[PDB]
From a paper:
The large terminase protein is a key component of the DNA packaging machinery in tailed bacteriophages and evolutionarily related herpes viruses. Typically, in addition to an ATPase domain which powers DNA translocation, the large terminase contains a nuclease domain which cuts concatemeric DNA, generated by rolling circle replication. Crystal structures of the large terminase nuclease from the thermophilic bacteriophage G20c show that it is most similar to the RuvC family of the RNase H-like endonucleases. The overall structure adopts the RNase-H fold.
Structures for complexes with Mn2+, Mg2+, Co2+ and Ca2+ were determined by soaking crystals of the apo protein, whereas the structure of the Zn2+ complex was obtained by co-crystallization. Only one metal ion, bound to the site A, was identified for conditions containing Mg2+, Mn2+ and Co2+. This metal ion is coordinated by the side chains of D294 and D429 and four water molecules in the canonical octahedral geometry. High resolution crystal structures of complexes with different metals reveal that in the absence of DNA, only one catalytic metal ion is accommodated in the active site. Like RuvC proteins, the nuclease requires either Mn2+, Mg2+ or Co2+ ions for activity, but is inactive with Zn2+ and Ca2+. Similar to G2P and UL89, addition of Mg2+ resulted only in limited activity, leading to production of nicked or linearized DNA when supercoiled DNA was used as substrate.
Residue numbers in the entry: 254 to 442
Write the structure that this text describes.
């Protein structure tokens, strides 16, 4: 890790085997005695959308779905299917700047969701610090997928011109997986 790495506890991250089924990485199938939620961010244009299914009873990711180039309606339909697959798991959705169509469609399609708009650096910092703390404590368990691990590894601290802290991917990288995981783990006690 570089000096400015956010996830200093990456050594305590539990790595899980999985089966790749198209856009899903499936660690385990639905356990009906457990309660699940899904962290969801939505991509515009060629950006990725990432849905992270978290078993709230074990603290482990059961399934992670990631894709780009999907229509807005297809993003919502895939989220609905994942929710239904995991017992009508509730969605923690980053609703900031998602647009009228997706907002209307979540409601119109009866998706079980709670809004968590990542509307400022302050909100992002709360989400991230919670994930990072849980990680150091050995409570975060994710699919052992190099893309996921690399995105976590490359998430770094910077400062703005006014001196405020910001967190973002190194170089010209992405953080859609990081934020999806943080949205899921925001619910974990």
């Amino acid at each position: 890790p570089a000096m400015n790495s956010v996830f200093s506890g990456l050594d305590m991250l539990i790595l899980l085997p999985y089966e790749r089924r198209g856009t899903r990485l499936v660690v385990e199938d639905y356990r009906p005695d457990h309660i699940y939620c899904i962290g969801a961010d939505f991509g515009k244009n060629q950006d990725y959308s990432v849905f992270s299914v978290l078993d709230l009873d074990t603290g482990a990711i059961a399934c992670l779905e990631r894709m780009n180039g999907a229509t807005w309606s297809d993003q919502v339909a895939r989220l609905k299917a994942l929710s239904e697959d995991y017992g009508h798991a509730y969605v923690v959705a980053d609703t900031w700047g998602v647009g009228d169509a997706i907002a209307e469609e979540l409601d119109a399609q009866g998706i079980n969701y709670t809004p968590l708009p990542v509307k400022s650096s302050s909100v992002k910092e709360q989400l991230i610090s919670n994930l990072a703390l849980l990680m150091e404590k050995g409570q975060v368990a994710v699919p052992n997928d190099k893309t996921i691990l690399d995105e976590l590894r490359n998430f770094r601290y910077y400062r703005t011109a006014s001196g405020n802290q910001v967190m973002r991917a190194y170089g010209r990288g992405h953080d859609d997986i990081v934020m999806s995981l943080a949205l899921a783990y925001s619910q974990y006690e």
